[PDB]
Design a protein around this ligand. Structure first.
Ligand code: I6W
Ligand code: I77
Ligand code: PYJ
Ligand code: PYJ
Ligand code: PYJ
Ligand code: PYJ
Length: 9
């Protein structure tokens, strides 16, 4: 989950 978001950065 964290990674799913972190791709933005
Ligand atoms: C959410 O974006 C998220 C959570 C956890 C994972 C993930 C990917 C790969 C592994 C892995 O290779 O584990 C080896 C024990 C674990 N968790 N991806 C995305
Ligand atoms: N928001 N994330 C990025 O801008 C980003 C993170 C990580 C990478 C990247 C690219 C290539 C490798 C590799 N070949 O091991 C690892 N991480 N790009 C963009
Ligand atoms: C449903 C959001 C999500 C994304 C990736 C991993 C787990 C959960
Ligand atoms: C963690 C990378 C990812 C995101 C969404 C769906 C599958 C795999
Ligand atoms: C900026 C694109 C995006 C949207 C949602 C989650 C991650 C990345
Ligand atoms: C940031 C890791 C990742 C990989 C594939 C897809 C989304 C996110």
């Amino acid at each position: 989950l964290a990674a799913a978001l972190a791709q933005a950065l």
